[PDB]
Amino acid sequence: TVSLPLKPREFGFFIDGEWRAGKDFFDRSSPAHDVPVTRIPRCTREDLDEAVAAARRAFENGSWAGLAAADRAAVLLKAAGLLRERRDDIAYWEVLENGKPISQAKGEIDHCIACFEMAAGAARMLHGDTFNNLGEGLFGMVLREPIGVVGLITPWNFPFMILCERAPFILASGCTLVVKPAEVTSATTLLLAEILADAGLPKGVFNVVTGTGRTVGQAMTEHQDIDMLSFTGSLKKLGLELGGKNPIVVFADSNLEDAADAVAFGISFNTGQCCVSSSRLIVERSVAEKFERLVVAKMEKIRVGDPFDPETQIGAITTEAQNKTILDYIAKGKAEGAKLLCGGGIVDFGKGQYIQPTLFTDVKPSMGIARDEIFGPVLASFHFDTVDEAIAIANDTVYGLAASVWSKDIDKALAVTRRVRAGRFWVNTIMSGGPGREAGLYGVEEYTQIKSVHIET
Amino acid sequence: TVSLPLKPREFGFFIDGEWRAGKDFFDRSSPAHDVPVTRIPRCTREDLDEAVAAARRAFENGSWAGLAAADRAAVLLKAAGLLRERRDDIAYWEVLENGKPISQAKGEIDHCIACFEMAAGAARMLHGDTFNNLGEGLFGMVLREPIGVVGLITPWNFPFMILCERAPFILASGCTLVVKPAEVTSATTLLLAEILADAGLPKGVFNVVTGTGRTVGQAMTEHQDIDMLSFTGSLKKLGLELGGKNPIVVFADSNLEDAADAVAFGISFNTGQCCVSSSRLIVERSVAEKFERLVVAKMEKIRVGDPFDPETQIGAITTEAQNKTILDYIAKGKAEGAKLLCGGGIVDFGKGQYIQPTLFTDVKPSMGIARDEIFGPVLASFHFDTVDEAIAIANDTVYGLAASVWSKDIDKALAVTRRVRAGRFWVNTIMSGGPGREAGLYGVEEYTQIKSVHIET
Amino acid sequence: TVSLPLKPREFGFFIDGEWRAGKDFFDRSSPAHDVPVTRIPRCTREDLDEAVAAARRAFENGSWAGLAAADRAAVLLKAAGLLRERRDDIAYWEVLENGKPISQAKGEIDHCIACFEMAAGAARMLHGDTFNNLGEGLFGMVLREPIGVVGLITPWNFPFMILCERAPFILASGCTLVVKPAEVTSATTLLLAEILADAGLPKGVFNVVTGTGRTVGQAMTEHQDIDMLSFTGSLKKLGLELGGKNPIVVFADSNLEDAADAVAFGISFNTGQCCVSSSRLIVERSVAEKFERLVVAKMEKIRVGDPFDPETQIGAITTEAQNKTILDYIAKGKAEGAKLLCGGGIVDFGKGQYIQPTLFTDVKPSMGIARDEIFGPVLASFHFDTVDEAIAIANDTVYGLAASVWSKDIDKALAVTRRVRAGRFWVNTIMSGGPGREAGLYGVEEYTQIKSVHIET
Amino acid sequence: TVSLPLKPREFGFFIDGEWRAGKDFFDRSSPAHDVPVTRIPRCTREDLDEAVAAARRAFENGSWAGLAAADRAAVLLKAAGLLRERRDDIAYWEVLENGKPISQAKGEIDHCIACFEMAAGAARMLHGDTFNNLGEGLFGMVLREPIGVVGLITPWNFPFMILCERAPFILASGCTLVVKPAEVTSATTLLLAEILADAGLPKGVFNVVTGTGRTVGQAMTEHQDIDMLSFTGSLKKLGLELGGKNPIVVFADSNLEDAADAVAFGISFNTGQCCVSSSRLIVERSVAEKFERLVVAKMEKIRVGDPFDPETQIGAITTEAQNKTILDYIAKGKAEGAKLLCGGGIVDFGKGQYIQPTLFTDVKPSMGIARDEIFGPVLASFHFDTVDEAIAIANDTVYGLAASVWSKDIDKALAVTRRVRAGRFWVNTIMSGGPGREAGLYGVEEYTQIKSVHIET
């Protein structure tokens, strides 16, 4: 019931409010269909310079940062509405370039819509401090101001969703933006550019420069007119972002059935879930065997196949590189004596590849697959006896995107929540971002600086 | 080793920086020694008017509110230091007028010293908001300002400690203050007036008017120049404060020994504890009998007697009224079929009266001693089967000063903490205020108002 | 083009979700038309008890406070939408009972709609604190909780608008509410009850008990089951609210034309203005004569007459009492030697009375009309030479609702803004609440308390 | 009266609590005396690895981050006290390595002491949020946690003062620290290491690795175990810091005498001033000539010479590089037609070099000395007619450390304060950091991350 493009769609890139024609082009085929779908400009360092100049111009001339926050919120809310009307179109191009199941793409869009609405509300709440207690001759205050021109680099796994977790909050403060998405998943980033123009965003406030990391990414990192650089793949600030080896710590006193469900939902896509992959299971030894059996039974129901089938839960491998990493990973795990409990293969389903939901158990932290990282429904199980063992296994990575703990014991739950390094933590619930927030309070502040002001008499 | 006054000490009251002689006087004898100890002025409505006028004058003329917060903090910290040097003197007069054990009085003083230091720090942190996001032609902000002249009425049970939980925070914002302490426990409130003068508080910022509720209290409640009226016994704001029927909810999955200790410490005075009386025990039926036995064993070790003995843990009954309430209470409890498990009597120990640590069990919420309230080491035990039964028994009062819950189960702990109405909550710990705080963040703000400011271009 | 009621409309009062029939009734005629318009129940003390019990029941049983904030916001936003659909109906009954110009009533409604929307957003943002820095064995936090059952008493001058500045913020935290509006202006408060039922507010969350101050007001102030009592006319908290002698301070270095416009708008109703009456002018002596002439010229253009005429700017006197106060006031001002510059009379325009815009100059602060207060477009002008004279004249009242200052000099503007006691301050702009806010940040918190929570290991 | 070292003092570097011997060494002579004063280890990449490992170990093992904030504050306050006792010793080594006047060094130390005390207080106030309004089955909160291991690189101009503006706030959150100071001004950074050991800082929490930017700096920027990298000269975050071309905007309606004083104090060192160099003057054309004459008269009183003379206000040139930049700068300014109004030379005063206070006027923004930057008492004056001209000249740099404006006009003051990009702003006062703060509220938060926590039932 879903027709592929008759000819690959050629995009332009987006600078200072207008579409721009590419010279050279990256040809992208559908990971699930092996059919040409898009043609993406490979921009030059000179193109990125123009995008930065446009964003500079739009920041400094007052057209965005000088507006009242209400006007910025109005644009963001209109974009949210347009994004809702065009949900099926954005999901379609996302599936085509990334392999994602359509139901997961549509669910990510709903989370994206909500991000636009949070950013809009938070634009109005942004505030600083007054110091009225310095005595009669002296008055102090702190103002919050947009950081300025923000460079954003997004990755290929969650191209649209990471963009919408960042871009609307960046724009809400009055910052301007230049985005470089991954060469393999650029279409939806450009469709967002169109949405924001249609919503009334002034020219130069949102610019998309497509192309390679070697050319456009490097020009971005070395540009001396970008105030802040934010990498989610990978001049005052540069932020980086961390890995998807998100651990799930399960204790014997927990609800093992709910916990096993959460492991299953955290590795596949289920309705009402959105966007928190997990790849490490950390389970009390005395229940490891029963719980792992629970998880394997659920993992073998996960539906794999045609991403345009609304019931698919695992989509196609996005790049040919990701394909060798997975078969390498599994080979390494077998070699080092990790026990494969299910999956382990890549399914050739027609003209696409699909990773089987896969679970290694008896994994020691010193093994090579405990260090290495992969994207895909591949899960490694570690066992522990003590609370401090669980925490040390959980913390064995550099820093975590997400984490969760299952336990009815308040001391164990709190100890894990406080001592495991992750940005988002779930306690006896499914890790999900779909049907106040921290991003509601703080997403906008992240792209601001403070100005202290000292007024005598 | 402790000598009583040879003659009762006659205090003056304190208005606009100077001591003032009484005309009529309330003669106060030591609850523990039946010996005259103090002579307290019974002030007139005209006296209170002068105190309010002085506090009005000192607020409006800039001598306190117009200073920088640093100057207010310096005075408060100097008072804290003076309060430390005079700890033994303040404890002595507190014991003499109130019957409190000396070790409890000294422990309350240490908490009072810490209140002065918190208020001093919070004076500097007090702040409002800036709205820099209204566009270029418009600037908004919120300022915090002292409410103005504050009337404070304190009670006889914790006369000095309630004063120091309020007064330094009131003064820290720039408010001025008129205090009416209880006629039976006024001495330490006047010694604080002396301390604050010695610390350099300007005249009229702290005024003490002693006398009866009928005369000075009524003039205070009806005065139309007091900006805020704060009753802890009992013109924009009037605050009241609530009861000491603080419940302690104990679940079967808790550490019953620690929980029983907390009940014992919460009813007596132990070293390292300060100031959270508890009087209702709410214990899961399946462990009620074992736990109550644990509590009775500890209650019968509580040392009762000479309050100047540093080992005493329960002091003398403060007023003759409180004496009939207790014997009435216990009589009522027996009549309605509550089971007395220990205590029940008042000990005539020389020239003083002392309430035995007392525990009724098998108390239904409909009984009359569940409604009625008493001060003294008198404890009533209710039994429950479900979480919601515990919460409903805990909430059967109007509103709680404090509460605690003992449970290893995170859902039960959180449900009780969120749904039981109390201002301060302990979870698997002893209720105590002795060896960031909420009072650190919020004590000063309570006596401020906000001014919104809207500036065009 | 506007038809009066054929027969006066008989309202019921509103308790626990249902309309209730009165026994005795207050008959209300239109201040502008001298025609019966409404019939309002005079409720009993027993009626108020039932309303409090219903609000108690609805607070304690979880039907409102236990919902997520999102569900409370959804109801408040639906009520805002219903209030928009019924704007003409609510304006009509407001005009009929109060005499207000229809354009002012419609403008107040728009401000009311915005209050509902702010409260809805703020319901979601309400938050407390975590203390993660107490060490490994200890965790602290502060929770915000609804205060509980709130009693609200509203006045006859801005009956609907004061209600909507309070009620949606009270409801947003999870509080429940009992309202007693002024006997002469009750209709719109009951129409809001209908709106909130139609928006899906659970039963007992909003209750309206009409009747006299002597009966229903007294029962309310003395009720021991109301957690907070808020008077805007006139158990832990009681708030009062202050007067409409809002001063406007004009300096010689200001834009005298804009400043004079602001005085004119602040005394009448103009399009795009909403709801900040001003009644004291404080003007630098060296420009007092020129500026007062500017103000008189604008005051004599103010349109007076039929409140259903959309061009009327001053409506009918609301009560027969307010009528003698005005003629008394003006008589007093003449007797004491204040110079009448314009107005001074009450116009009998058909079957209604209308206060002429009136301006006394040469008013010394010691005069009796400087003390006395009136509602109506009656303005008194004081003169000053120094910044501190202006501030002392401005502060000569108890506490101010609003204030403004006109000056290009940053030191004079800031000195007046900081040292004049008012809740809302305008600087070189028109005082208005019509076409982030302080009420956005703080309106909801005002009806909450904090619970500190201390969790060991 | 001040004796130089008989032999240059050889320092070790500081890793994991112990002093470490160098292999190769940088020999440093006094800029003012041309006498050997210090011998600084040139550390290896391997040395930096050990420092990072030590800081890693000390962060992860709980010895610092796991303490209560009170214990961290106690160490920081003890260090503040030790820093006070050793003020003369730290000033002495600072003067010796940097050339700074002794009175400026002692004044910077006092600011450093105050930074330690702010950080100590802020350690206790650090807090996150609770979301109690998600309904009964759900509880949310945000925690603040130390970012982890922080790399800090400091510059040679304010070596000790920049260190103390950063290090105590970094340590206050529980972060651990590795510092690389400038090779020419390392001594005081190592003396701070000694101070912190003497104050009881655990091993590995503060580590100093000295040496070159090419070796130790590069190893630091490329190290993959540093959580945050902070450059003030020049893995989730990297911060940079901006220039000292701090503009001072002077309007004709200002107090030209006070404004001229502020320019003089902002370029030299005066008693009661601390640490805000300014180098661009932006003055309304109609008063440019009178004001510049005012500034030149004050600039020619500035005392230049022996930095150990307590009256010196301008010290010796720190490096031989800075020496050619200055004579180049002045040469360029003459060539492009900027008018030299005073100074222009480097004084050879014995065995040291000293920059004369120097003021170019008639500088157009397009000139090369408007772009170029220098450190030294060298001032360039631009002229403007309109508010927007002043703002555009002020903003012609990348981003400002500080800025100030002189004007009695509230619209001009506010327009400049809001639209000029600087982190710290003064309005009609001297730019100074010497005898609540923004750093008090925010310095500690800068080295923290937020963890959102979502707890179901």
Numbering used by the authors:
A (entry chain A), B (entry chain A), C (entry chain A), D (entry chain A): 7 to 240, 256 to 456, 469 to 490
Quote the study that presented this structure, word for word.
Finally, L‐sorbosone is further converted into 2‐KLG by a NAD(P)+‐dependent L‐sorbosone dehydrogenase (SNDH). Sequence analysis showed that the SNDH of G. oxydans WSH‐004 belongs to the aldehyde dehydrogenase (ALDH) superfamily (ALDH‐SF).
The first structure of SNDH with the addition of NADP+ was identified as a monomer. This closed conformation results from the extension of the catalytic loop (Ile288–Ser300) toward the outside of the protein. A disulfide bond is formed between the catalytic cysteine (Cys296) and an adjacent cysteine (Cys295) in the catalytic loop. This interesting phenomenon suggests that the catalytic loop of SNDH has motility, which may be controlled by the redox states of Cys295 and Cys296, thus regulating the opening and closing of the substrate pocket. There are two missing loops in SNDH, loop A (Thr241–Asn255) in the cofactor domain and loop B (Glu457–Trp468) adjacent to the catalytic domain. In addition, the dynamic light scattering shows that the particle size of O‐SNDH and R‐SNDH in solution were similar, both in the range of 11–12 nm. This indicates that O‐SNDH folds as a tetramer in solution, but it is more suitable for analysis in the form of monomer structure.
